[PDB]
From a paper:
We have focused our work on the iron(II)/α-KetoAcid-dependent Oxygenases (αKAOs), a mechanistically diverse superfamily of enzymes that use dioxygen as the oxidant to catalyze several reactions via C-H bond activation, mostly hydroxylation. These enzymes operate with three substrates, dioxygen, α-ketoglutarate (α-KG) and a primary substrate. One of these, [name], catalyzes the formation of (3S)-3-hydroxy-L-lysine, while five others, KDO2 to KDO6, promote the formation of (4R)-4-hydroxy-L-lysine. We based our analysis on the structures that we solved by X-ray crystallography of two of the regiodivergent αKAOs active towards L-lysine, namely [name] from [name], that catalyzes the C-3 hydroxylation, and KDO5, from Flavobacterium sp., that catalyzes the C-4 hydroxylation.
The structure of the [name] form of [name] was determined without iron in the active site, lost during purification, while KDO5 retained the iron throughout. While a ferrous ion is present in the KDO5 [name] structure, it is not the case in [name] [name] as the metal is lost during the purification from the [name] preparation used to grow the crystals. After crystal soaking with FeSO4 the two His residues (178 and 314) and Glu180 in the [name] active site recapture an iron. For [name], the lid is well defined both in the [name] and complexed forms, but the adjacent loop, from Ala160 to Ser171 (not in the logo except for P5 and P6, respectively residues 167 and 168) undergoes large conformational changes. Among all CSL dioxygenases whose crystal structures have been reported so far, this is the first time such a loop motion is observed. Its motion seems to be induced by α-KG binding as this loop is closed in [name] and complexed forms with products and lysine, but opened when α-KG is bound.
Author numbering: 30 to 358
The structure:
């Protein structure tokens, strides 16, 4: 029954939540139609947040031994929440007061970014159940478990962080988290060395494909390792559906990672007023089966992405643009 610990939990006091609510009034631009102005206003207004909150976010952003995630509780209550949309085309979360609270916290950590090939390049995406993709390996699934993965395993432009703010929760929908440090603690020396070898080719996610769309990096990339970086602070790239072992031992090692994940993963049921930051280099994430009703009261998260460095994607964006063009993913 492992859950996110006190070190990986930031609880806002009533006073801190009130400051955050007032500071959100400094963020006035349209999140979808003036994304850069919106994000830059949030980055500047974030200087007005409580110092204790800013300190925890900057520590998490630095990354060194950060646990892989940070759960924030006590965000100001979403009071006039519209019904949960049945698809992600409406971008309902992007005009809620939560989008401003989420942007302020995000912009303490790093620069918000979006991807043309992911949820229409929306600054905030509605993470809601899809009746079509219910049995699919996507953030809109429900009837099947969302398998352990890092976000955009195939892409060098993958986000540094995934930001999930909860508008409506579902009691059966558990978010699973598993860090590269937790993984390495269960493995033998030989398994760690092998995961550090470039033995996995990676393929572009099927949802990124489109008629007449060509990727500069091609459809199949690598081979790449699963583990990299410092021995005591390893980075992870993992996705069974998009990473193919170049040999039978390479395929067996992904099974080793999956078993360690089922044995050691921590869980948390996201509730309204909560926000989860996942370090996409240090942890993998998943989600349990749940049973949505598609009745306007379903689980509803606002998803956004963060990168430490916006210059890394400049070649893939327009001037004062926050959207990475699909061909560069």
């Amino acid at each position: 029954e492992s859950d996110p610990e006190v070190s990986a939990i930031l609880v806002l006091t009533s006073s801190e939540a009130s400051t955050l609510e007032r500071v959100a009034d400094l963020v006035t631009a349209h999140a979808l139609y003036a994304a850069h102005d919106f994000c830059a206003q949030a980055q500047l207004a974030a200087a007005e947040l409580p110092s204790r909150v800013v300190a925890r976010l900057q520590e998490f952003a630095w990354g060194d031994m950060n646990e892989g995630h940070l759960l924030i509780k006590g965000l100001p209550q979403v009071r006039s929440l519209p019904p949960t949309p049945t698809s992600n085309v409406h971008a309902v979360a992007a005009t809620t007061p939560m989008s401003r609270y989420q942007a302020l916290i995000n912009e303490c950590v790093g620069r918000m970014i979006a991807y043309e090939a992911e949820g229409h390049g929306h600054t905030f995406q509605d993470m809601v159940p899809s009746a079509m993709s219910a049995h699919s390996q996507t953030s809109l699934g429900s009837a099947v478990e969302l398998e352990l993965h890092t976000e955009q395993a195939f892409s060098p432009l993958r986000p540094d962080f995934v930001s999930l703010a909860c508008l409506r929760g579902d009691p059966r929908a558990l978010t699973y988290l598993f860090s590269a440090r937790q993984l390495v603690a269960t493995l033998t020396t030989q398994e760690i060395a092998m995961l550090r070898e470039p033995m996995w080719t990676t393929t572009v996610d099927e949802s990124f494909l489109a008629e007449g769309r060509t990727f500069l990096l091609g459809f199949e990339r690598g081979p790449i390792p699963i583990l990299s970086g410092a021995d005591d602070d390893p980075f992870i790239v993992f996705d069974q559906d998009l990473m193919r072992g170049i040999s039978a031992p390479a395929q067996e090692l992904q099974q080793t990672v999956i078993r360690a994940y089922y044995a050691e993963r921590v869980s948390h049921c996201l509730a309204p007023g909560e926000m989860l930051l996942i370090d996409n280099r240090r942890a993998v994430h998943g989600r349990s089966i749940f049973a949505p009703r598609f009745d306007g009261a379903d689980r509803f998260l606002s998803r956004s992405f963060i990168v430490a460095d916006g210059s890394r994607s400049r070649h893939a964006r327009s001037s004062f643009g926050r959207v990475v063009s699909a061909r560069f993913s």
